[PDB]
Design a protein around this ligand. Structure first.
Ligand SMILES: *[C@@H]1O[C@H](CO)[C@@H](O)[C@H](O)[C@H]1NC(C)=O
Lengths: 50, 48
């Protein structure tokens, strides 16, 4: 995926890995190597009007 | 798949009201046919 990985304040349960929003799209990930939760936010984008 | 939960129930009806969701405890890669089950109890020797 392409996104920004940030610190999270979401209290994940030990079994829980992925995280999802109301759109059932990946919003957080738990890394196997280091057991920490990285919030995933899509990178900034927008329409350009001239 | 085994799911479990421990809930402190205030003295009353054994099956209480309300919700207490069971968290996933273990997923075991067994691959066997299971149609029947039985509960195991512990019994103490009397020594009398
Ligand atoms: C390697 O990964 C395991 C789980 O994937 C983790 O428990 C362990 O801490 C990792 N090793 C190090 C040095 O972080």
């Amino acid at each position: 995926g392409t996104g920004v990985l940030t610190e999270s304040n979401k209290k994940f349960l030990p079994f829980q890995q992925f995280g999802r929003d109301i759109a059932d799209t990946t919003d957080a990930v738990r890394d196997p190597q280091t057991l920490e939760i990285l919030d995933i936010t899509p990178c900034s984008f927008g329409g350009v009007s001239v | 798949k085994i799911y479990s939960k421990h809930t402190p129930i205030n003295l009353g009806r054994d099956l209480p009201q309300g919700f207490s969701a069971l968290e996933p405890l273990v997923d075991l890669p067994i691959g066997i046919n299971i149609t029947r089950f039985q509960t195991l109890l512990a019994l103490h020797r009397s020594y009398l």
